[PDB]
Amino acid sequence: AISKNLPILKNHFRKHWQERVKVHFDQAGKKVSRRNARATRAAKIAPRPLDLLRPVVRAPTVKYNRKVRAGRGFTLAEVKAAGLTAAYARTIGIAVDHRRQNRNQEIFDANVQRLKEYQSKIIVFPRNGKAPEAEQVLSAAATFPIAQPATDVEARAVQDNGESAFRTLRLARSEKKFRGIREKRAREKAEAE
Amino acid sequence: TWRKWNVKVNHNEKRYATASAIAATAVASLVLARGHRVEKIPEIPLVVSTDL
Amino acid sequence: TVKTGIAIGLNKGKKVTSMTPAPKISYKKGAASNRTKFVRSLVREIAGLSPYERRLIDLIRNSGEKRARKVAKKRLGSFTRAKAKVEEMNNIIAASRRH
Amino acid sequence: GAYKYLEELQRKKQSDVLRFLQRVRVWEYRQKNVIHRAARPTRPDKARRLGYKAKQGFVIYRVRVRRGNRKRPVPKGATYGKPTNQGVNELKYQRSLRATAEERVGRRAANLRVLNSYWVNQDSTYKYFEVILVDPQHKAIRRDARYNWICDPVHKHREARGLTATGKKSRGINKGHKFNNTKAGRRKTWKRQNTLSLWRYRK
Amino acid sequence: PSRFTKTRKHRGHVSAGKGRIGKHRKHPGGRGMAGGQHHHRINMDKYHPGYFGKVGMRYFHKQQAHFWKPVLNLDKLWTLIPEDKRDQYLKSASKETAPVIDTLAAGYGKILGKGRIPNVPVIVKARFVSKLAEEKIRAAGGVVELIA
RNA sequence: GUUCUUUGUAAAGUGCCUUCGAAGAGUCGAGUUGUUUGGGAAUGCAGCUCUAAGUGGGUGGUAAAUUCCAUCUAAAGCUAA
RNA sequence: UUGACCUCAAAUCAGGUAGGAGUACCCGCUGAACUUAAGCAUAUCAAUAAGCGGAGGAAAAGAAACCAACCGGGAUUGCCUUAGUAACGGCGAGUGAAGCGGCAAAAGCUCAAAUUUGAAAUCUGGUACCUUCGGUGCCCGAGUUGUAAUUUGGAGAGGG
């Protein structure tokens, strides 16, 4: 059973796995269905852009915090800052997320400017039925793409103030480690006299 | 049914053979040996007008 | 919290212009009303005390509050609910035979 | 509004006024049948916050069930297996007693739909529950679009599939890491992670 | 291709390459990792040292993204700069026009001092740096700006 | 695309100031027992026992006390792809 | 004596509804052993087969008492990945997720908790008529032990 040097394998096939094997033969078949579903939908949702406009959002989790990402909705405070109501915005194609807030000015002003550019690129048709048709653009994300912000510039000047860039890391890590016991030093001697 | 049917091929190697197959449509040494009857034609490659 | 701009330390993180957004109304689920204060006071005057609450008030007056919290922690779930119930029992006897 | 006063009063279950009514009502409910029709809800404020309305088509039933554990049948105590499965007297019946009360009512009144249920009284041997039932064939429920969703046939025997309030609690359907095993269905989640997914171009 | 297998070459031979005394059976020595401490110990030790037992401390609910810190040596430090602009910074080494390299955008967490860099002032923006990685950068006239 | 009916001193949306702002109980939670889970001083569930609070409560993957912070608003319900 | 109210009955009362089949897929209950560990009892097979109850064209889940510790994400589901990883286990055999990230698809909502109190404004049924998946009028009944309207926390209401 164990011989002839080999890495120890962990193959989880001790149950009735053959009864639950799913082979995706319909990968080509379902792809045609999605394109067919997208085509028959767009005719029913005449010339709306087939998707709602979604804001720019910074990811959590520092592995991903350096990137911006398309979010869910335009953050009710942002909708009022753009000059329209939330209930009206949902009928124009502006997705609204009521459960998220704004604690970043750069993200807030980018989303407000995103909404201003959207209202300047739409043709809202009256309820009467005049219909001056405005032949469909199939994507609202390809028209207003998500772009990474420009943090810094290409070239600057060398500013060497003399902090060595590593003692700062060693000191900051040390003062956090010994923060808790040093507040007790200020408490064990404050009670004197 | 879960036998392997489709075979994965590297994209660069897939284009490598396609470029070699276009270069196989060069001088009729390969074309005559491939069974095509191209002895009494002007030249290889044959370039015709766009009106086709 | 003002960030320091470095990846470690106490206030680690990039410096960002804060916005102090509007507080949510769902956060104010603790304080209910003046009317709910009126109703809850009326029901306790009607329903009176419960059998375990009668034992607690007989231990605060006799065996102090330290031993009463031990019984309240055994009766109620956690120790934090015991401290709030004993102080609640304290206000009943402070309004019973003080003045 | 008087419903605020009853709601606060119903939480004083060990007060003298409630425990006297508890002892009187536990006797009255025991003299009647196991399943019997209730003319009006015992707790109007508890019923109306569970979806009950005071009009034609809303029916209240009172049902009692036997308390305790579930004894495995296993005649003469023999299980014929490993010693890990020899327990007979400490099995706990993963469905709640309130769910059993709903299921017994839903078989007697098979023409109705179970909406919700609530605890009314209990003793050593019996736990008493009151179940709210609606009539899907009554025109007051077929109209009044706030309640016509129950008439659409996907809601047939909700309490028999664990779709009620006590049914989803027993199935553990909530959000978060504490319900990773049971948040989209225990058998569907297990089948999802025990399925060997193979594509045309093997990954 | 089954036509290139040794089963086709074993047609006509009785034992099919399994021997007449061995008599190939279902599981002569057990199933899977059976007997790693009883009759496969000579194979477990000698080619798998350390398999049995525990050494470390447990870590409940480990998130691998918490320990995300890709390293970038001082070897390259310039593939992050596009090749078109790389040469015009190398032959024009001077301050007040030092290139700013944000290693975080490239997908790196810590800078390590393995390689040797040309004597060009370079502005580096990184989350973490090694001790002597900073020394080689400062010796070339550059600085490291700590970011988050 | 056309056509017939005016719903209505109706309904709806937005600004400022002022007073309020009701929100689910044998339930949460706790002990114990059984079962279950990768969940490990106890993940979920259920039986029994105890039984809440209102600037409160739950959660923050090691049990406890103390002091903060962050995050949601349970014990009611509907809904396409 | 008479007329109500409450509760509980009766009728081949007026009008309806439930059963059974199918059950590939779905929602639950119940629940093994062969087998593996070269024995075997925990474990494994397996939260599986068999048994039982209940649906649909999908079902279920679903608009956070969530994930997170971040420069914060933002209903549910599925795929790729996380990952054979954290962890569990005679720490043996074996078992084994989840957050982030990319994509498919995208949709949000309302009851309880309020005095309409200058008017129960609500609804079933019967009957008559009509443009009949219903509408109008009239008459009994349901209902104040609360049916409508307004409000659902993202708020909102009383007011000016």
Side-chain angles (χ1 to χ4, degrees), chain D residues 4 7 10-14 43 46 49-50 67-69 84 90-97 116 119 127 149 155 158 164-165 169-170 172 177-182:
Chain D
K4 188 56 176 174
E7 183 178 1
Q10 289 299 333
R11 307 179 163 190
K12 310 305 188 182
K13 288 197 187 61
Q14 268 170 117
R43 302 162 64 201
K46 178 61 179 204
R49 66 173 150 256
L50 282 183
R67 299 185 62 187
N69 301 342
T84 185
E90 275 163 306
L91 294 175
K92 293 304 192 296
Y93 186 41
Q94 296 296 338
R95 270 170 71 93
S96 179
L97 285 171
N116 267 317
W119 177 94
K127 252 176 187 177
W149 63 267
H155 304 109
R158 314 172 53 223
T164 58
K169 174 74 176 66
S170 298
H177 65 286
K178 284 169 158 42
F179 311 90
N180 279 334
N181 272 314
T182 79

Side-chain angles (χ1 to χ4, degrees), chain A residues 65-118:
Chain A
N65 68 349
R66 69 206 210 269
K67 301 294 230 315
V68 285
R69 160 174 70 76
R72 187 179 173 85
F74 279 92
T75 301
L76 295 167
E78 291 167 358
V79 180
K80 185 177 180 180
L84 77 165
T85 43
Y88 177 73
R90 280 197 177 100
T91 73
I92 317 301
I94 299 164
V96 184
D97 190 11
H98 66 86
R99 72 179 67 87
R100 76 181 276 253
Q101 321 292 134
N102 281 135
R103 65 179 64 88
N104 192 344
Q105 196 72 53
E106 297 91 299
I107 289 279
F108 174 84
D109 291 331
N111 281 333
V112 168
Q113 184 57 39
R114 200 169 160 86
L115 278 191
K116 296 281 186 60
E117 294 293 328
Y118 184 74

